[PDB]
Ligand binder design. Sequence first.
Ligand code: HEM
Ligand code: XE
Ligand code: XE
Ligand code: XE
Length: 183
Amino acid sequence: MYGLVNKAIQDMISKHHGEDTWEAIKQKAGLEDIDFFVGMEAYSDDVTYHLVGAASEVLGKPAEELLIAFGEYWVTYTSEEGYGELLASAGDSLPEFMENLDNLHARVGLSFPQLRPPAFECQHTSSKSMELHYQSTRCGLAPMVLGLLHGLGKRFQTKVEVTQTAFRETGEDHDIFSIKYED
Ligand code: HEM
Ligand SMILES: [Xe]
Ligand SMILES: [Xe]
Ligand SMILES: [Xe]
């Protein structure tokens, strides 16, 4: 993934647990050689997966729990680190934002030519609910989507309940989330 993602992981861990903890995690991920992540540079997905695993071991938390926290953090991180206007242009409510998400990544894909973005499709069930279809070239990131949606809920001051109903992991075609939102 692009270095931006790795910078954000490093940033989250450093802020919450300090530099020493970050250094340990980086060491254990086998990335001692890397002095810093370059934001607009493409890295092997392995770099990100090794960071998550090492963080899980060092911090004593399941990787999935960390993915949730990271998904939430990313919504704030992007708005403060160069993407605030891009986010604002994707709308002012949870449902409109999720509708624009493919188009937002298309725009992101202008500047990050090698992007492999997720694909998100919305089926609205009411004015307070939707089924969200999540398709990816990558495994294991559904928990991050859950945290992202909560991050978006906080962004729009909107209560959200997210329950995963299909798992690309129990053999379903792709992840599907049922979402309830009020405000
Ligand atoms: C301005 C805001 C954002 C920017 C600049 C951005 C950029 C990126 C980048 C660089 C990646 C790495 C993909 C790669 O390197 O191939 C990514 C992946 C991803 N993004 Fe976005 N993103 C933004 C907002 C969001 C939001 C609000 C969501 C909410 C769902 C989201 C969902 C995801 C997911 C789930 C992935 C995992 C990639 C995958 O599934 O394969 N992003 N994004
Ligand atoms: Xe991300
Ligand atoms: Xe990630
Ligand atoms: Xe993480």
